[PDB]
RNA sequence: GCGAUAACGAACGAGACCUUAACCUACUAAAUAGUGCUGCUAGCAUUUGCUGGUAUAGUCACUUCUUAGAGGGACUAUCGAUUUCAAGUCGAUGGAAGUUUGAGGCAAUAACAGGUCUGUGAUGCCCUUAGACGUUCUGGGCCGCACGCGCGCUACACUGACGGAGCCAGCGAGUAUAAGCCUUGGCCGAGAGGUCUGGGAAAUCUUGUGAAACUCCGUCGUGCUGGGGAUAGAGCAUUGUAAUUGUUGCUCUUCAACGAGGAAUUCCUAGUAAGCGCAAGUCAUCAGCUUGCGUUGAUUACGUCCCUGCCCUUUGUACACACCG
């Protein structure tokens, strides 16, 4: 047994929820007690610049956004099992952090 | 726009 | 205003002409029927066409 | 010497800026002598708006 | 029924604990109370020169009673207000640090507070005792 | 009428409010009646409220204003001239004191005096302008009951504001003097001078 | 446990969570008696849900509310809504529905905001002006 | 520049106050200033004493507005 | 409580060669005295034990002299140095609090003391311009 | 780090490849009309739903001009422009 | 869109679409959220109660509030009026929502001698290229003052100023061997600020950002007054290699016009306008500025083409580089 925390971060929610559900599924069929996933409040990185490269025209502004979504899952399992779960459900978009 | 004139 | 457009009016009349017996005066039954008949990419457009075909069936 | 006249029909917007409305009034007592008159404020049907003077019609405004 | 601080109006509860604490007389008043301003945003010292320190200590005691380990920076923020900057817009400015620290120190050596764990200053076993006492002798009229 | 004993004690007057809903638990709407057939449907006093602060949605549709209480419309119209916008708690406090002063002065129903002053303050014929692009032209037209009521409230609050401007006399008692005088038809009051001058010009324009 | 219903009322941003348990006529605001709700001049807005039906309805229930967010007035409206909704949810769940429909009838006939949270929210600000609709003064 | 309200209370004004304020339907700070020609502060102290002397009954209490009446 | 008096009130006071209206409250009458602001007058009144509930004409001669004594000898009455008008004086380095005629006297001496050394601030004082760096493009129109 | 190189499947459906090819032709001296219609037809031959080519600059004239070479069906507003 | 119809049936744009706000006691979970219970514990009345504190092991429960994903929900739904009985419009009823449900993002066919080569290791050409128009160092200027104009902030008081007390948000940002971030707390200091520790690379700490308007109790009493705080004198700290021609902050003092504003002219339809503050950007320091956010929260239409701007039809043309003809 090992108390293991899994932190999930990505910009797009489709792959984040796919990885989250796949890990929960494997932590379900493996009789490993789990807590999660916990949807942490998403952070909206907003940048409002002026459209005009010069300073002529009507004052019009862009409003760009970058949502960051975070999920944490708590597992009680050996480190070999959790790491091989990470390699089974490794995805380019979603980042994974493992903390003891 | 100006003509640099030297002194030294 | 609440003016229906051509893309919903013509779709609703096509529904009237293609599935008349299966249609009825209930908006929810019409809505479910349109969902299971025609492929609409959004529930908003779906509800709108269902409302117009409901009004047509009323008329 | 004031006469009370219930409105029974809103005819339409008149005046240069459209701020005054032609309306058809009916007197509360002696329910006849229906007149077309102009009113400034917003008006629905069944308004008991009172008239300081009654013996005057209204026509289109320039 | 058991009367508490939450069962009494704040304005006359503070006026009553201030009145009791003044007639009791053990609270130590610093020598600069007739000179200083309460906040840098204020422009004049308090009009109730003799009693403002007592009343402010009563307010601090009641505020700590109703809350948990409030600090002195938070007390300065609480009693600070909008400064009358001349032509620039108003802004929030903190109350005096020395004045607040002396008030809380006076309540700590009179027995109502002590240093609480994980920061702040809790209310004492007898601090609650004497606040509930003032409340009882507050609401009989 | 029975006093209901709770663990959390409830004051006597507010527990007395169970029998009847009264303005500030002091003034009754039962014995108040509008002495004008034409403004009954646009001055709403039939549904009593306890305090003149409801935070309702009366600006959505056209005639929703007729359903807000007339006293709440007065306290809404009081908070004007820039520095007072948004100070509704101050406006309700001033109105509450004004009713108490109107009761203590002349010994009448405060909301009866407000209703009488509103029916008595709205001009019955106004001379609208028909100017052709700049030139001065006036035509006498009738005034709808809704505009008569809300122009009465506009003039009543403007008169109280101007009587209370740069004056030691407080706004609540300037409002009290203007409302009592307009209720009793005195020509000394503002919004009665204005109403008379409006109907005089309308008589001199038709 | 016991007969407990938990509810919430809302105004613009303020939310008051009401817990209604079976007990004595205890009516507290954040652990404080209802006789000292601020502002003083608006105390009758929260007195309306009590005195309209009669305090006898509160013999069997005790109410503890927690109001956070919003502003002073929005919190007053949130508390009075939380009180009204907690009483309604208790009647709907543990007493006959005749009483629940009577309470809902009086409540709706008196004030819509007592049970349904107002959906109006602040419009976002748009560039080119200091407000949602307001624009910078234009000059030629 | 016409106010010239009295700020010092003599005996002639004191008894004029006690002889005139009672014959009023409604007295307040502004009423006292308007008709007795005394200052606002003197009106407030006059009200605070007349209430202790029983001539005046407090109809309503407020900092910004003091509504008072005769006790007879 | 309200008290009455006859013949003791003084409509006009004369302190530091300045006429003071006797029916003004003491804190702001002394604020009428040049060099004495509201903040300073409240403190000289508390050091002179003159309760603020008294009008200027209500005040007696003994208190007025005790006040002018405190104002003329501030350090002698436990008035902090940092509270004073003219502290760390240029010539003698002592803490001062200038009054009605001395304020403009030592202010003048400061203007000439900068202009004699021909500092930039003294020059701008001579020219009548703003000295604290303010822009004069669009507001120096008086 | 490991780099793998993969050929783009639909050169006609890749605007980057078509733009690089057009640049290499204009820099190879091919006429604008022939190159633009060469990409209009390469895109349609590849199966594009629509295609539009705009060439702006100065060409053998002191005054500058722009020419658009559209084809087929094109959408302009909304999300589908971000999708298709 | 209906309809009339030498037109019929279509495409782009509009509309659809996407983001965000408002509903979910209906699912899925949450010690970085909350609650009820339970341990342990305090005060007051002793009624078994009421307020607290504590529990990253009580190795509790739950998701109403908090977070966020899959969905559901509104389509003018039902009923009355008018209408070509059509598109629609106005009222109610139900509803969280019946103004495109509110707000935005994207946005056609062509075009402008509109603005930028002072954003580009984007550029053609011209100029300069060693005493440089390249780059760097020092000091000054961009602030400069008889004046005209534009965007604004404070105000002209009493619906107010001070003095105490009450005491409620949301949007966000935050560091490491650096070159210094957000900083709770303790101890000094009237303040500004100083010193010592700790937390936070963050739903955990700053932070419940206890913000300001707002409410209560007092003094003031229509006075250029305790409104207003320029101008000016002296001093104390912070930032910066350097504050003088003041960075900013704080203390005392100085006590100006302004007593509601001419001709003209701007913005504004609902949580909107107006007040009221807060965060982020520029940033060693400096926000009277923008970009957003929330507190309090209206008056008055819900109409018209009278002014103003734009569009369409007819019409005239000796214009087509198109009236700058």
- Residue J80: exposure state from Cβ atoms within 10 A (0-12, 13-18, ≥19): exposed
- DSSP assigned state of E87: S
Which nucleotide lies closest to F53 by the C1' atom and the CA atom?
A: K297
- Residue G84: exposure state from Cβ atoms within 10 A (0-12, 13-18, ≥19): buried
Tell me whether chains B and J touch (3+ CB pairs under 8 A): no
- Inter-CA distances, G136 with A51, F90, G126, I23, Å: 18, 30, 11, 50
Alpha-carbon dihedral sign for residues G122, G125, G126, G129: positive
Strand order in the sheet with A61-76: A34-50, A61-76, A3-10, A95-99
**Closest Cα partner for F152 from F181, F112, F124?**
F124
Token look-up 């209500």 returns I58
Cα D36 to the center of its chain, rounded Å: 6
Q: Give Cβ neighbours of residue F135 (< 8 Å, ≥ 6 apart).
A: none
Q: Round to whole Å and give the CA distance between I70 and H56.
A: 44
Which element (helix H / strand E) includes E61?
A: helix E52-66
**Closest Cα partner for F21 from G59, G102, G104, G45?**
G45
Chain E residues with CB inside 8 Å of I46's CB? 34, 49
Nearest to D61 among F63, F130, F202 (CB): F130
Determine whether the interchain pair I42/E43 forms a contact, defined as Cβ–Cβ distance below 8 Å: no
Helix, strand, or coil (residue A81) = helix
- Inter-CA distances, D10 with D13, D59, E2, I71, Å: 9, 14, 68, 81
Binding-site residues on chain G for chain F (CB distance < 8 A)? 11, 24-28, 33-35, 39, 41-45, 47-48, 50-52, 54-56, 58-59, 62, 73, 77, 111-113, 118, 120
**Closest Cα partner for F196 from F115, F121, F143?**
F121
Q: Which tokens belong to F194?
A: 């204005």
Chain F nearest CA to D37, separation (Å): 8
Closest-CA residue in chain I for H52?
Answer: I1
For F12, half-sphere exposure in the C-beta direction (CA atoms, 13 angstrom radius) is 0
Q: Round to whole Å and give the CA distance between J52 and A50.
A: 28
What share of residues in chain J are helix, strand, coil (percent, to 5)?
Answer: 35, 20, 45
Tell me whether chains C and H touch (3+ CB pairs under 8 A): no
Length of chain G: 140
Separation of D52 CA and K272 C1' (Å): 38
- Residue I39: exposure state from Cβ atoms within 10 A (0-12, 13-18, ≥19): middle
Q: Give Cβ neighbours of residue G84 (< 8 Å, ≥ 6 apart).
A: G9, G49, G107, G114, G115
**Closest Cα partner for J22 from J2, J8, J37, J4?**
J37
Q: Round to whole Å and give the CA distance between F104 and F177.
A: 12
Q: Which tokens belong to E50?
A: 């003799």
Q: Which tokens belong to I74?
A: 């501030």
Q: Which tokens belong to I43?
A: 């403190």
* Contact indicator for G136, G130 with CB cutoff of 8 Å: yes
Phi, then psi, of A41 in degrees rounded to 5: -60, 125
Beta-bridged to residue J52, according to DSSP, are J70
Q: Round to whole Å and give the CA distance between E47 and E63.
A: 22
Q: Give Cβ neighbours of residue F99 (< 8 Å, ≥ 6 apart).
A: F23, F24, F27, F110, F111, F114
Cis bond leading into A37, ω under 30°?
Answer: yes
- Residue H7: exposure state from Cβ atoms within 10 A (0-12, 13-18, ≥19): middle
* Contact indicator for G118, G126 with CB cutoff of 8 Å: no
Nearest to I2 among H7, H9, H11 (CB): H9
- Inter-CA distances, F97 with F103, G41, G46, H66, Å: 10, 12, 21, 9
Nearest to D20 among F37, F41, F141 (CB): F141
Q: Which tokens belong to G98?
A: 């005749």
Beta-bridged to residue G4, according to DSSP, are G21
- Inter-CA distances, I43 with I16, I49, I50, Å: 18, 10, 10
Helix, strand, or coil (residue A35) = strand
For I142, half-sphere exposure in the C-beta direction (CA atoms, 13 angstrom radius) is 6
**Closest Cα partner for F6 from A96, G63, H8, E61?**
G63
Closest-CA residue in chain A for G135?
Answer: A59
Kind of pairing, strands G27-29 and G61-68? parallel
* Contact indicator for E81, E139 with CB cutoff of 8 Å: no
* Contact indicator for G66, G72 with CB cutoff of 8 Å: no
* Contact indicator for F7, G25 with CB cutoff of 8 Å: yes
**Closest Cα partner for E4 from E124, E129, E140, E123?**
E129
- Inter-CA distances, E5 with E57, E71, E138, F143, G28, Å: 15, 20, 10, 59, 13
- Inter-CA distances, F199 with F121, F168, G83, Å: 11, 33, 52
Token look-up 């809404």 returns F76
To the nearest 10°, report the CA torsion of C27, C32, C34, C40: 110
Nearest to E45 among I42, I79, I80 (CB): I42
To the nearest 10°, report the CA torsion of I42, I45, I50, I55: -60
Phi, then psi, of G108 in degrees rounded to 5: -70, -40
Q: Round to whole Å and give the CA distance between E60 and E76.
A: 11
Chain H residues with CB inside 8 Å of I1's CB? 49
Q: Which nucleotides of K are covered by protein (CB under 7 A)?
A: 1-2, 10-23, 25, 29-32, 34-37, 42-45, 49-54, 57, 64-70, 72-78, 86-92, 96-111, 113-116, 119, 131-133, 143-173, 183-194, 203, 207-226, 228-236, 244-247, 249-255, 259-260, 266-278, 287-307
Contact F97/H at CB under 8 A: yes
Determine whether the interchain pair E35/I39 forms a contact, defined as Cβ–Cβ distance below 8 Å: no
Closest-CA residue in chain G for E10?
Answer: G36
Residue F24: CB atoms within 10 A of its CB come to 18
Q: Round to whole Å and give the CA distance between F89 and F78.
A: 11
Determine whether the interchain pair G51/F15 forms a contact, defined as Cβ–Cβ distance below 8 Å: yes
What number of C-beta contacts closer than 8 Å exist between A and G?
A: 7
**Closest Cα partner for D38 from D54, D59, D52?**
D59
Q: Round to whole Å and give the CA distance between A14 and A36.
A: 17
Chain G nearest CA to E64, separation (Å): 15
What's chain F look like in SS3? Answer: CCCCCCCCCCCHHHHHCCCCCCECCCECCCCCCCCCHHHCCCCECCCCCCCCCCCCCCCCCCCHHHHCEHHHHHHHHHCCCCCCCCCHHHHHHHHHHHHHHHHHCCCCCHHHHHHHHHHCCCCCEEEEECCCCCCCCEEEEECCHHHHHHHHHHHHHHHHHHHCCCCCCCHHHHHHHHHHHHHCCCCCCCCCHHHHHHHHHHHCCC
Q: Round to whole Å and give the CA distance between A76 and A31.
A: 10
Based on its alpha-carbon atoms, the radius of gyration of chain B, rounded to whole angstroms, reads 7
* Contact indicator for I100, I106 with CB cutoff of 8 Å: no
Which element (helix H / strand E) includes D22?
A: strand D20-27
Which nucleotide lies closest to E118 by the C1' atom and the CA atom?
A: K185
Residue I99: CB atoms within 10 A of its CB come to 19
Based on its alpha-carbon atoms, the radius of gyration of chain G, rounded to whole angstroms, reads 18
What's I58-124 look like in SS3? Answer: CCCHHHHHHHHHHHHCCHHHCCCHHHCCECCCCCCCCCECCCHHHHHHHHHHHHHHHHHCCCHHHHH
- Residue F94: exposure state from Cβ atoms within 10 A (0-12, 13-18, ≥19): buried
* Contact indicator for F147, D42 with CB cutoff of 8 Å: yes
* Contact indicator for G100, G91 with CB cutoff of 8 Å: yes
- Inter-CA distances, A77 with A35, C57, E76, F162, Å: 12, 61, 49, 79
Cα I93 to the center of its chain, rounded Å: 20
Strand order in the sheet with H56-60: H26-27, H67-70, H56-60
- DSSP assigned state of H63: S
Q: Round to whole Å and give the CA distance between H20 and H22.
A: 6
Q: Round to whole Å and give the CA distance between E103 and E30.
A: 9
Q: Give Cβ neighbours of residue H22 (< 8 Å, ≥ 6 apart).
A: H55, H70, H72
Q: Round to whole Å and give the CA distance between F176 and F182.
A: 10
Token look-up 């009370």 returns D4
Q: Round to whole Å and give the CA distance between H55 and G109.
A: 47
In this complex, which chains have at least 3 CB pairs below 8 Å with chain J? none
Determine whether the interchain pair I83/E45 forms a contact, defined as Cβ–Cβ distance below 8 Å: no
Experimental method for this entry? cryo-EM
Q: Give Cβ neighbours of residue H52 (< 8 Å, ≥ 6 apart).
A: none
Closest-CA residue in chain D for F62?
Answer: D42
- Inter-CA distances, A81 with A19, A88, A100, F203, Å: 16, 10, 14, 97
Binding-site residues on chain I for chain H (CB distance < 8 A)? 1-6, 9, 23, 55, 57
Kind of pairing, strands J65-72 and D20-27? unpaired
DSSP E strands in chain A: the ranges are 3-10, 34-50, 61-76, 95-99
Chain D nearest CA to F59, separation (Å): 15
Beta-bridged to residue I60, according to DSSP, are none
C-alpha angle I95-I96-I99 in degrees, rounded to nearest 5: 170
Helix, strand, or coil (residue G47) = helix
* Contact indicator for G77, G14 with CB cutoff of 8 Å: yes
Nearest to F170 among H26, H59, H64 (CB): H64
Chain G residues with CB inside 8 Å of A58's CB? 128
Phi, then psi, of G136 in degrees rounded to 5: -60, 140
């Amino acid at each position: 047994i090992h108390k293991i925390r899994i932190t999930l971060t990505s910009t797009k929610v489709k792959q984040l929820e796919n990885v989250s559900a796949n890990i929960i599924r494997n932590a379900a069929q493996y009789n490993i007690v789990k807590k999660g996933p916990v949807r942490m409040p998403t952070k909206v990185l907003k940048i409002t610049t002026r459209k005009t490269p010069n300073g002529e025209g009507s004052k019009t502004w862009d409003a760009y956004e970058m949502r960051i979504h975070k999920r944490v899952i708590d597992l009680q399992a050996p480190a070999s099992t959790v790491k091989r779960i990470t390699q089974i459900t490794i995805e380019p978009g979603v980042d994974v952090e493992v903390t003891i | 726009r100006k003509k640099k004139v030297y002194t030294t | 205003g609440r003016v229906r457009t051509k893309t919903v009016k013509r779709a609703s009349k096509v529904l009237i002409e293609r599935f008349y017996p299966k249609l009825t005066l209930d908006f929810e039954t019409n809505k479910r029927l349109t969902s299971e008949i025609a492929v609409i990419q959004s529930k908003r457009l779906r509800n709108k066409i269902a409302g117009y075909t409901t009004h047509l069936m009323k008329r | 010497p004031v006469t009370l006249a219930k409105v029974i029909k809103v005819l339409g917007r008149t005046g240069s800026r459209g701020g005054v409305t032609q309306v058809r009034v009916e007197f509360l007592e002696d329910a006849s002598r229906t007149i077309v008159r102009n009113v400034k404020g917003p008006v629905r049907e069944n308004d008991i708006l009172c008239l300081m003077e009654s013996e005057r019609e209204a026509r289109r405004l320039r | 029924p058991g009367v508490s601080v939450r069962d009494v109006p704040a304005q006359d509860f503070i006026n009553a604990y201030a009145q009791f604490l003044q007639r009791q007389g053990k609270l130590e008043v610093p020598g600069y109370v007739d000179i200083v301003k309460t906040s840098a945003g204020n422009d004049l010292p308090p009009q109730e020169a003799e009693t403002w320190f007592y009343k402010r200590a009563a307010s601090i005691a009641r505020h700590i009673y109703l809350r948990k380990q409030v600090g002195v920076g938070a007390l300065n923020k609480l009693y600070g207000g909008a400064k009358n900057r001349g032509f620039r817009p108003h802004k929030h400015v903190d109350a005096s640090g020395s004045i607040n620290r002396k008030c809380v120190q006076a309540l700590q050596k009179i027995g109502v507070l002590e240093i609480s764990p994980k920061g702040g200053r809790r209310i004492s076993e007898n601090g609650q005792r004497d606040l509930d006492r003032i409340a009882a002798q507050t609401l009989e009229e | 009428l029975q006093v209901v004993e709770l663990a959390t004690t409830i004051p006597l007057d507010v527990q007395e409010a169970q029998r009847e809903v009264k303005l500030f638990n002091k003034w009754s709407f039962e014995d108040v009646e509008v002495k004008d057939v034409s403004l009954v449907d646009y001055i709403q006093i039939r549904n009593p409220v306890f305090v003149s602060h409801t935070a309702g949605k009366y600006a959505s549709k056209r005639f929703r204003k007729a359903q807000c209480p007339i006293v709440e419309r007065l306290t809404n119209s009081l908070m004007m001239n820039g520095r007072n916008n948004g100070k509704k708690l101050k406006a309700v406090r001033i109105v509450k004191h004004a009713l108490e002063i109107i009761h203590v002065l002349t010994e009448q129903n405060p909301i009866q005096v407000v209703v009488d002053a509103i029916v008595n303050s709205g001009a019955r014929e106004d001379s609208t302008r028909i100017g052709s692009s700049g030139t001065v032209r006036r035509q006498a037209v009738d005034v709808s009951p809704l505009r008569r009521v809300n122009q009465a409230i506009a003039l009543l609050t403007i008169g109280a504001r101007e009587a209370s401007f740069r004056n030691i006399k407080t706004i609540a008692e300037c409002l009290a003097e203007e409302l009592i005088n307009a209720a009793k038809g005195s020509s000394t009051s503002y919004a009665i001078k204005k109403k008379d001058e409006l109907e005089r010009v309308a008589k001199s324009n038709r | 446990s016991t007969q407990s219903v938990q509810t919430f009322g809302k105004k613009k941003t303020a939310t008051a969570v009401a817990h209604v348990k079976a007990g004595k006529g205890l009516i507290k605001i954040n652990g404080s008696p209802i006789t000292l709700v601020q502002p003083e001049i608006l105390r009758f807005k929260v007195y309306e849900p009590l005195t309209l039906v009669g305090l006898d309805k509160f013999q069997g229930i005790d109410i503890r509310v927690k109001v956070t967010g919003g502003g002073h007035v929005s919190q007053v409206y949130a508390i009075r809504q939380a009180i009204a909704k907690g009483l309604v949810a208790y009647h709907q769940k543990y007493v006959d529905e005749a009483s629940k429909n009577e309470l809902k009838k009086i409540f709706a006939s008196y004030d819509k905001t007592l049970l349904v949270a107002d959906s109006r929210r602040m419009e976002p600000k748009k560039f080119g002006g200091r407000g949602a609709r307001a624009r910078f003064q234009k000059s030629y | 520049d016409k106010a010239q309200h009295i700020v010092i209370l003599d005996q002639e004004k004191y008894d004029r106050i006690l002889k005139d304020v009672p014959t009023y339907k409604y007295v307040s700070v502004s009423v006292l200033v308007d008709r007795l020609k005394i200052g606002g502060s003197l009106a407030r102290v006059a009200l605070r004493q007349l209430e202790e002397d029983g001539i005046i009954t407090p109809v309503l209490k407020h900092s910004k507005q003091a509504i008072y009446t005769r006790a007879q | 409580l309200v008290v009455q008096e006859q013949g003791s009130f003084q409509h006009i006071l004369r302190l530091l060669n300045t006429n003071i209206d006797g029916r003004i409250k003491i804190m702001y009458a002394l604020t009428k005295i040049r060099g004495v602001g509201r903040r300073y007058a409240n403190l000289v009144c508390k050091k002179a034990d003159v309760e603020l509930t008294k009008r200027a004409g209500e005040l007696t001669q003994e208190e007025l002299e005790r006040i002018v004594t405190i104002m003329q000898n501030p350090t002698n009455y436990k008035i902090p140095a940092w509270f004073l008008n003219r502290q760390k004086d240029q010539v003698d380095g002592k803490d001062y609090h200038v009054l009605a005629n001395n304020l403009e006297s030592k202010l003048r001496d400061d203007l000439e003391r900068l202009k004699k050394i021909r500092s930039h601030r003294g020059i701008r004082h001579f020219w009548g311009l703003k000295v604290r760096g303010q822009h004069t493009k669009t507001t120096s129109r008086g | 780090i490991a780099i793998y190189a993969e050929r783009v499947e639909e050169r006609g459906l890749s605007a980057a490849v078509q733009a690089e090819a057009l640049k290499a032709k204009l820099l190879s001296g091919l006429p604008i009309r022939r190159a633009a219609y060469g990409v209009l037809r390469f895109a349609m031959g590849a199966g594009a739903k629509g295609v539009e080519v705009v060439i702006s600059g100065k060409l053998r004239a002191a005054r500058a001009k722009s020419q658009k070479y559209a084809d087929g069906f094109m959408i302009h507003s909304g999300q589908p422009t971000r999708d298709f």
